[PDB]
Write a protein that binds this ligand. Structure first.
Ligand SMILES: CC(C)CCC[C@@H](C)[C@H]1CC[C@H]2[C@@H]3CC=C4C[C@@H](OC(=O)CCC(=O)O)CC[C@]4(C)[C@H]3CC[C@]12C
Ligand SMILES: CC(C)CCC[C@@H](C)[C@H]1CC[C@H]2[C@@H]3CC=C4C[C@@H](OC(=O)CCC(=O)O)CC[C@]4(C)[C@H]3CC[C@]12C
Ligand SMILES: CC(C)CCC[C@@H](C)[C@H]1CC[C@H]2[C@@H]3CC=C4C[C@@H](OC(=O)CCC(=O)O)CC[C@]4(C)[C@H]3CC[C@]12C
Ligand SMILES: CC(C)CCC[C@@H](C)[C@H]1CC[C@H]2[C@@H]3CC=C4C[C@@H](OC(=O)CCC(=O)O)CC[C@]4(C)[C@H]3CC[C@]12C
Ligand SMILES: CC(C)CCC[C@@H](C)[C@H]1CC[C@H]2[C@@H]3CC=C4C[C@@H](OC(=O)CCC(=O)O)CC[C@]4(C)[C@H]3CC[C@]12C
Ligand SMILES: CC(C)CCC[C@@H](C)[C@H]1CC[C@H]2[C@@H]3CC=C4C[C@@H](OC(=O)CCC(=O)O)CC[C@]4(C)[C@H]3CC[C@]12C
Ligand SMILES: CC(C)CCC[C@@H](C)[C@H]1CC[C@H]2[C@@H]3CC=C4C[C@@H](OC(=O)CCC(=O)O)CC[C@]4(C)[C@H]3CC[C@]12C
Ligand SMILES: CC(C)CCC[C@@H](C)[C@H]1CC[C@H]2[C@@H]3CC=C4C[C@@H](OC(=O)CCC(=O)O)CC[C@]4(C)[C@H]3CC[C@]12C
Ligand SMILES: CC(C)CCC[C@@H](C)[C@H]1CC[C@H]2[C@@H]3CC=C4C[C@@H](OC(=O)CCC(=O)O)CC[C@]4(C)[C@H]3CC[C@]12C
Ligand SMILES: CC(C)CCC[C@@H](C)[C@H]1CC[C@H]2[C@@H]3CC=C4C[C@@H](OC(=O)CCC(=O)O)CC[C@]4(C)[C@H]3CC[C@]12C
Ligand SMILES: CC(C)CCC[C@@H](C)[C@H]1CC[C@H]2[C@@H]3CC=C4C[C@@H](OC(=O)CCC(=O)O)CC[C@]4(C)[C@H]3CC[C@]12C
Lengths: 253, 96, 52
């Protein structure tokens, strides 16, 4: 039995599902940290989360210093080869600077909270690496990765069309604005949420020049026509091409 | 979708409400707003609500991230994985 | 005025086309160019969609 404990524990599927349950535990604890309030000093649950990130960083440093190549530059090179390790390092450094800003009193404290919840995103996405062990989910993960470039192409042409609708909307309707960065918000605000449903139906052609209204801006009739053009091009052409791209890349990838 | 949806749920319910007590309503608000955004309702009023102005309740700090990341989520949910579900449904159709 | 703001509207419609001219610059890339001519192919199918 004394060797049977060792036989079970040092077995690699066992040593994996330890790491999986520990990751699930850490992620549930970190959800309880970031959603619920945090006081001046850290809580017990948060101390568990701090300890996880720090001992993970110790493990990453150790596994740098147990790779075969002789030079330290060579070890950090072969470690920088795998992308999840460098994203791991970046997230660990962002969580540590978030911890330093947390232990510091306001105003830095809530900025540190922001850094915590931005690391929440990445420590969710590492469960995809956890999903890679499955024979049915692993290929799906690599599939997501292979169609991201096909989405990237879509993203540049969508920026080109979206900025067209944006500039023409922001420069027909609102004609008299001083130099301010707020225009840049409007440029990427209203057209982008139109792809996913919401057409902002109340604010396309407001009723105007009537008695019940603000004066009609000249040429404000071209905005529904160009919104018609953008809506057709964005939701009927390019998304449907992305359907086509994705299907004809699936049989290969 | 559960993984991506809950990462959004954590991020929005962290930045927007900063002083919440332990309550199970947090576990409702983590799924509520992300899930009905797949189906064609982005909850337009509360995308970038006007805050910290005089015309209003003040801005929670870091709130400007909440629209931006949600932009990312709509590119992942409605444009990547539903479209992969189109592809999955389509080239296993002949087999089934 | 009243012609000034109408000339501004003419500029405003012209920025549409000067964005669409970025497709010519997009036609040098070995990954983007065929996608541009591919959109040009799909336009006819969308035209048939437009009548029905
Ligand atoms: C590592 C992963 C897999 C989770 C494992 C769960 C337990 C080993 C831990 C995680 C969080 C812990 C709890 C975190 C906070 C508290 C509050 C704590 O109460 C106080 O700190 C207030 C009173 C005091 O300060 O003495 C009592 C222990 C308890 C319930 C802990 C009991 C043990 C728990 C459940
Ligand atoms: C088995 C693996 C997959 C890990 C499972 C995780 C659970 C064992 C952990 C995750 C979150 C934990 C909870 C996180 C927070 C709390 C509040 C804690 O109460 C306090 O801290 C009181 C003070 C306060 O809330 O202000 C009591 C333990 C409890 C319910 C914990 C109980 C144990 C939980 C459910
Ligand atoms: C809410 C938003 C922020 C979510 C965004 C998710 C993406 C940032 C993630 C999801 C899936 C990830 C991909 C999943 C799989 C892979 C394969 C993996 O690459 C390898 O294993 C190759 C290593 C080598 O060959 O050296 C890591 C990158 C990549 C493309 C990942 C890159 C990051 C992606 C696109
Ligand atoms: C192909 C894509 C990337 C084109 C994007 C075009 C616009 C979104 C950018 C390009 C130049 C930007 C302008 C560059 C400089 C300024 C000055 C800036 O002025 C200040 O911040 C005031 C500070 C001061 O001078 O005291 C306000 C934003 C503005 C008008 C910018 C608004 C947004 C503009 C028009
Ligand atoms: C390739 C993909 C990922 C998109 C291309 C990147 C740019 C088109 C984006 C990325 C980040 C964006 C910026 C993020 C934040 C701001 C601040 C924003 O400022 C305000 O909104 C302040 C004024 C207000 O109160 O509204 C103006 C737009 C701007 C410069 C954005 C302009 C467009 C940027 C540069
Ligand atoms: C399947 C598709 C290709 C056919 C239908 C598309 C167009 C023929 C439609 C869609 C929306 C319509 C527009 C919706 C609203 C307006 C605003 C309207 O402006 C006014 O009436 C001025 C303001 C006022 O009412 O006082 C002029 C017509 C116009 C541009 C319409 C022109 C015809 C458009 C572009
Ligand atoms: C990951 C994908 C495939 C599924 C994600 C969807 C569900 C996990 C979410 C979406 C909406 C959620 C529901 C939204 C609201 C409620 C009502 C809630 O009841 C109350 O709040 C009591 C009524 C009251 O507030 O007075 C109980 C949880 C429930 C059913 C939630 C359960 C979890 C649901 C179904
Ligand atoms: C990472 C994914 C897969 C799971 C995420 C799980 C969390 C969203 C859950 C797990 C533990 C939950 C907590 C467990 C215990 C409690 C105590 C609970 O307090 C009461 O019910 C009060 C009872 C009383 O009045 O005495 C309020 C919800 C809360 C904070 C829960 C909030 C939601 C948590 C953090
Ligand atoms: C998607 C498939 C793989 C299964 C998904 C299971 C979980 C993601 C769902 C199933 C039922 C859900 C629960 C159903 C009921 C509730 C009670 C609900 O409590 C309230 O709404 C309290 C009332 C209030 O809001 O004031 C909080 C969400 C929660 C824990 C839900 C959290 C998410 C759960 C566990
Ligand atoms: C490349 C294609 C896929 C288009 C991508 C769209 C993004 C470039 C746009 C869409 C929504 C935009 C965001 C919408 C709202 C805001 C809030 C804004 O914050 C403020 O104005 C602070 C003041 C306040 O809101 O109180 C900063 C820019 C930002 C993040 C914008 C940055 C640029 C975003 C992410
Ligand atoms: C922002 C709103 C106002 C919508 C604007 C829609 C049109 C002004 C643009 C959008 C995409 C453009 C198309 C994109 C690609 C091409 C291919 C290009 O032609 C070639 O490269 C020649 C070879 C070939 O015909 O394929 C120029 C025409 C055309 C159909 C373009 C015609 C003008 C279109 C329909």
């Amino acid at each position: 039995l004394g060797r049977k404990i060792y036989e079970f524990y040092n077995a690699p599927i066992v040593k994996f599902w330890f790491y999986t349950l520990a990751y699930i535990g850490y992620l549930m604890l970190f959800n309880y940290i970031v959603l619920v309030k945090m006081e001046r000093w850290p809580s017990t649950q948060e101390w568990i989360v701090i300890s996880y990130i720090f001992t993970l960083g110790i493990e990453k440093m150790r596994e740098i210093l147990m790779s075969e190549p002789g030079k330290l530059l060579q070890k950090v090179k072969v470690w920088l080869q795998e992308y999840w390790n460098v994203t791991d390092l970046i997230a660990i450094l962002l969580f540590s600077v978030g911890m330093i800003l947390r232990l510091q009193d306001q105003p830095f404290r809530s900025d540190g909270r922001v850094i915590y919840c931005v690391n929440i995103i990445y420590w969710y996405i590492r469960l995809l690496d956890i999903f890679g062990v499955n024979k049915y989910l692993g290929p799906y993960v690599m599939m997501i990765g292979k169609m991201m470039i096909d989405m990237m192409y879509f993203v540049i042409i969508m920026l080109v069309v979206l900025m067209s609708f944006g500039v023409a909307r922001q420069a027909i309707l609102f004609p008299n604005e001083e130099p301010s960065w707020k225009l840049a918000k409007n440029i990427f605000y209203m057209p982008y949420w139109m792809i996913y449903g919401e057409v902002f139906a109340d604010q396309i052609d407001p009723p105007c020049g009537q008695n019940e209204l603000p004066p009609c801006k000249t040429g404000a009739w071209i905005v529904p026509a160009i919104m018609a053009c953008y809506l057709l091009v964005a939701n009927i052409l390019l998304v449907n091409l992305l359907i086509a791209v994705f299907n004809n890349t699936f049989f290969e990838v």
